[PDB]
Structure formats: structure tokens, C-alpha cells
Design a protein around this nucleic acid. Structure first.
Lengths: 215, 222
RNA sequence: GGUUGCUCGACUGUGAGUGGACCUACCCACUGUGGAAACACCACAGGAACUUCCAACCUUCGGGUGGCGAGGUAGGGCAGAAGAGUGACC
């Protein structure tokens, strides 16, 4: 018997200066008891709108709340890069309280090829019998990229794990780190370790690479 | 302007276990405000948990924790608490403490949040991180970092040079090793000149295991 | 015996549209606002509207003033009054 707050879009790419609109729809009338929150990745949430159209003290006038019956809309007249965040509606019209599922907003910049490097495993690591190879794609955009490990010109599969930074609030760029992991024995079976990068900013797939043992 | 909320009493707890989160207030009195707990599972959304309303102590609970959690406030200690019993996996989250603003000022909006404290309901035993260095190669800037490998639970903190170096640094999100443990790696890029003369130490701190390591990242020895 | 007053008075009424606004105290509610206040507590303002009434007050007798939570309890108020007395008159 809860007010459902149904937010959408689940996500949003938009250019700087654009108008962006996020809509939350209350399964029951919640008067104007709606507050909106900004949350940059790994901070707490910050209050934006209270009572569905009152701009909380200190919030940039580009943000604004609005109500139309049971349908609430947050608006950014003109995106800054800072406004990379996840946005949540809340209703405190009645307990239990309720949040939207959030909307991840993303900056949109001109294309940036990754800076690429490759790291052959540390010598302490090899004594402990593990061997992890790191490939690093630095400060690029759009976040969509394709990394491929090849060991002795053999495409690997399932034995790498990558992870990406959050969009830079300033650059609006990304950074990735693909990590092939092998048992020490499996690592001493091959010479060449390559990291093939296919990004939109690259007009040709970059490969950093190394051979085992070279100084 | 000391308005602050400082949660604590989180951590790694066996399933079915109990924890009592504490939340300490500054620069205002909680006797005059409604106080709410809100939790966020990793990469998930916000989820209101409970709240206790001023002057009456009346408590309200999200229905997913109704009867396992008990929000309460101590006037004297300017603290609010959440006893949690019969914890399950899905109770895993960061648990935030929020002040509901003064009506004449900010409606029923939550105007101050804690940094939040992280509750990791599993039974898999803690293990600290084995940090390995990542050296630069020979290629006007190059990159160097640390590989913080096979630890549990989140979180680790990495700083460089005791936070002296801060620019150009990327610390990647931990991913979950098939081993169930966390691994991650922090990297900074620096100009190729400083290699010879600039010592580069990453500082790794894994408070869950009481582990702190400092790893000097030096270039190719040969 | 009437007839009527006069006085006392058990008891009963305070009637809602073709027709109910008497007062006070407590309790109990209901709505809105405000109190650092979503509930609880406190304060304060209200109980649709059109009517109806004057148990109340003032009157130059023309009128005017003021007044509604159909709650409960308790006093009262105003009406009746069974009865008594108590006269006058026939």
C-alpha cells in the first residue's frame, strides 16, 4: 500500500548547455510533498528541490522543480559538467517514504582517444605464484571501447576483468583498466603479451605489448 | 555552521547478526528535527529505512525492515541509533543518517546527510590486500601505480606520497574476483623526467583488516 | 361546587425545513493554521450555505446588539406543570 515513485529516464546523455528533464510519477497523489536530490558518485545526496518546486538554499538557479498533479519534473536549463550525478525524487507525503529509482546523467564532450599503457607483473607478485597483467586506457571519451588481450597472438577470453572510472566532472572523460590474470605457470608459457584497444578516437586499433623477461 | 552527521558502528557482520549504527549530530539539536535512516546497496538506489519524529518519538519503518530494525534517539547524547537484528545479505548497504529540514525553511526535504557507513552482511572472513607495484616503462609522459589485490571487505583507500601527490591520479573501482575477494588498482601519470629523482609511494589502508601498507613504486630495475 | 387568580411545587420538556439556536463547567471529539512540530502534545481560529429563533441584552418600540460542535456529563435558565396550599369572585 505504498506510493510508488516511478522515475524515468533510467539514464541520460546530453550535451553541455542542453535542457534535461527527469520525470517521477506518484502512484497516488502526494500533494507537493516531493523533494529532489543530486548525488555525485560516492558522496552523500544533496538536496535540490523541496515541496516539488521550491529551490533549496544554495542550489544553482538552473535547476527547478515542477508539479502537474501526480507528475513531478526536475529541469536543468543548461547543463554544466558539474551536473554529472544521479538524480532521485522523493515523496514524504506519507510513511513509508519513497524514492525514485534514480537517473544517471552523463556529460557529452568531443571524442578523446585513450592514452594506452601496459604493465607486466611485479616481481614480488611472481614469487607469490600469481601473475596479473594490467592494461590502462587513460582519459578518453566516448566510454564505449573494446579491449582485447592476445597472448602470442591468441585472443584471450574470460580471464580479464576491467573497470572504468566515473565520468570526470571536469574533463568528462573516462579511464579503463583491463586486467588479464594468469597462474604463474600459465604466464611462463608465452612470450608476447599484447593489449589491443579499439576506440572511436583511434582510427586504427592501438596495441601496447611486451615480451616476457625483457629489461 | 557546524551542521554535521557522523555515522558509525557499521562493518562486516555475519548473516543473522546484529549491529547498532550510531549517528552523532553537530551544530544543531536533534530534539527539534525528524531524523531518518536511508540505505544504498552497492550501485543501487536510495532506500528509506526508518525515521523518528520530534517531540513525540513516534517511529516509522520501511516495511522491508519492519520488526528487525529499531530506530531510537537519545536526547542527552545528541545521538540517534538503529539497532539491526537478523541481518540478511540484502541488508548490505551504506546506511545514511539524514536530518529533515525545518519546515519554514526546507519543507520535508532532507537537508543534511552523513557520509554514511557501510554494512557488509556476509560470512566470508576478512582478508587484507596484497599490494604490488606497477612500474613505468620507457614511454613526454608515462604512468605508474599500485595493484591492490585480493582483499575483503571493501573499502581500501589509496593515497600517493601521503596525499602529497593528488593530480593525474585514477583509482579504479574494485571488482569482485572470482575468489570472492576484491582487487583494484590505483594509477597516476607523471612526467618522464621525475622518474629518476621523485620517489613515488602509494599508501594503502584497509581498515577492516587493520592493514596499512606503503609501497614504493620505482622504475624498471634493469 | 365552580371561576379565576396568587404562591409553593413532584415531575417533564427544551421539539431541526411545514421548523430546534437558553447559560455555564468539565470531558469528549471534528476542521484549519501556527508553535524548530507529517503523528503525538500545546495554542489559536473555525464548524457548509440558505434559513429559523431570541430561551439573552438594548430600545425612541421603528429596530438594533450578540450568538450553532444537533457529542457526553453536570449544574443551572426558560417553559410547562401532577399535585398542594392560598386567596378573591360566583
Amino acid at each position: 500500500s505504498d506510493i510508488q515513485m516511478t522515475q524515468s529516464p533510467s539514464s541520460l546523455s546530453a550535451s553541455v548547455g542542453d535542457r534535461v528533464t527527469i520525470t517521477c510519477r506518484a502512484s497516488q497523489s502526494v500533494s507537493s510533498a516531493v523533494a529532489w536530490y543530486q548525488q555525485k558518485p560516492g558522496k552523500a545526496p544533496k538536496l535540490l528541490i523541496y515541496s516539488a518546486s521550491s529551490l533549496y538554499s544554495g542550489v544553482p538557479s538552473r535547476f527547478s522543480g515542477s508539479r502537474s498533479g501526480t507528475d513531478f519534473t526536475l529541469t536543468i536549463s543548461s547543463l554544466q559538467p558539474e551536473d554529472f550525478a544521479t538524480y532521485y525524487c522523493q515523496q514524504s507525503y506519507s510513511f513509508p517514504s519513497t524514492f525514485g529509482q534514480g537517473t544517471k546523467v552523463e556529460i557529452k564532450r568531443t571524442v578523446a582517444a585513450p592514452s594506452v599503457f601496459i604493465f607486466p607483473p611485479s616481481d614480488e607478485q611472481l614469487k607469490s605464484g600469481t601473475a596479473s597483467v594490467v592494461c590502462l586506457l587513460n582519459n578518453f571519451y566516448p566510454r564505449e571501447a573494446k579491449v582485447q588481450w592476445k597472448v602470442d597472438n591468441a585472443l584471450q577470453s574470460g580471464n580479464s576483468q576491467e573497470s572504468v572510472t566515473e565520468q570526470d566532472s571536469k574533463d568528462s572523460t573516462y579511464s579503463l583498466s583491463s586486467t588479464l590474470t594468469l597462474s604463474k605457470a600459465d604466464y611462463e608459457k608465452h612470450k608476447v603479451y599484447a593489449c589491443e584497444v579499439t576506440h572511436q578516437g583511434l582510427s586504427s586499433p592501438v596495441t601496447k605489448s611486451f615480451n616476457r623477461g625483457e629489461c | 555552521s557546524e551542521v554535521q552527521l557522523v555515522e558509525s558502528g557499521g562493518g562486516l557482520v555475519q548473516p543473522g547478526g546484529s549491529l547498532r549504527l550510531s549517528c552523532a549530530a553537530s551544530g544543531f539539536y536533534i530534539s527539534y528535527s525528524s531524523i531518518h535512516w536511508v540505505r544504498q546497496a552497492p550501485g543501487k538506489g536510495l532506500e528509506w529505512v526508518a525515521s523518528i519524529s520530534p517531540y513525540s518519538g513516534s517511529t516509522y519503518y520501511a516495511d522491508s525492515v519492519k520488526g528487525r530494525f529499531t530506530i531510537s534517539a537519545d536526547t542527552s547524547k545528541n545521538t540517534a541509533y538503529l539497532q539491526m537484528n537478523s541481518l540478511r545479505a540484502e541488508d548490505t548497504a551504506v546506511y545514511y543518517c539524514a536530518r529533515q529540514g525545518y519546515r519554514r525553511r526546507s519543507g520535508r526535504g532532507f537537508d543534511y546527510w552523513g557520509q554514511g557507513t557501510l554494512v557488509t552482511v556476509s560470512s566470508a572472513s576478512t582478508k587484507g590486500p596484497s599490494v604490488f607495484p606497477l612500474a613505468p616503462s620507457s614511454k613526454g609522459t608515462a604512468a605508474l601505480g599500485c595493484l591492490v589485490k585480493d582483499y575483503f571487505p571493501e573499502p581500501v583507500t589509496v593515497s600517493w606520497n601521503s596525499g602529497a601527490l593528488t593530480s593525474g591520479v585514477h583509482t579504479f573501482p574494485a571488482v569482485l574476483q572470482s575468489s570472492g575477494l576484491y582487487s583494484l588498482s590505483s594509477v597516476v601519470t607523471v612526467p618522464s623526467s621525475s622518474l629518476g629523482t621523485q620517489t613515488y609511494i602509494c599508501n594503502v589502508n584497509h581498515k577492516p583488516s587493520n592493514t596499512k601498507v606503503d609501497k614504493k613504486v620505482e622504475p624498471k630495475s634493469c
